Design a protein around this ligand. Structure first.
Ligand SMILES: COc1cc2cc(c1OC)O[C@@H](C)CCn1cc(nn1)CCCOC(=O)[C@@H]1CCCCN1C(=O)[C@H]2C1CCCCC1
Length: 128
């Protein structure tokens, strides 16, 4: 499925080229602009453990998930991945534990050394 396709054909967007954050663009956005550190960003997302044992959607809240980019308000893989996205874009990310919750995890919700998958839609971003 989606996670396996990202393993096989996904772009490595880490600085370290360690395959810790892999990306496929599923729908292209608009304009050239991508968000800067500090920008307020608005997204819809669906997320799961790679084996599918916990599943979370912003659609379950009916409302966008909102955060300031690059302030570590989310896991490092989102700061990395969303910074690459254009307004309107939908992308898949597959993420190793080092760019998510690591060997400590976040129990009971996230186990130790968990790989994560997300589908992300970038709705908008606005300057500080
Ligand atoms: C580790 O705890 C959680 C992880 C995730 C979601 C969590 C959560 O409980 C705080 O709550 C959901 C269920 C309620 C909405 N929400 C998101 C956040 N705070 N509240 C932000 C929490 C930080 O989350 C993240 O950095 C990432 C990226 C942003 C969206 C949510 N993220 C998650 O890791 C989910 C997680 C995805 C994998 C399946 C299980 C949930």
């Amino acid at each position: 499925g989606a996670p396996a396709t990202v393993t096989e054909q996904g772009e490595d967007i880490t600085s370290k080229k360690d395959r810790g954050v892999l990306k496929i663009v599923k729908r292209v956005g608009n304009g050239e602009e991508t968000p800067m550190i500090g920008d307020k960003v608005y997204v819809h997302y669906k997320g799961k453990l790679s084996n599918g044992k916990k599943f979370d959607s912003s659609h379950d809240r009916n409302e966008p998930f909102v955060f300031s980019l690059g302030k570590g308000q989310v896991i490092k893989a989102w700061d990395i991945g969303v910074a690459t996205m254009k307004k309107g874009e939908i992308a898949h990310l597959l993420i190793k534990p080092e760019y998510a919750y690591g060997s400590a995890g976040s129990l009971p919700k996230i186990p130790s050394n968990a790989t994560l998958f997300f589908e992300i839609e970038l709705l908008d971003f606005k300057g500080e």
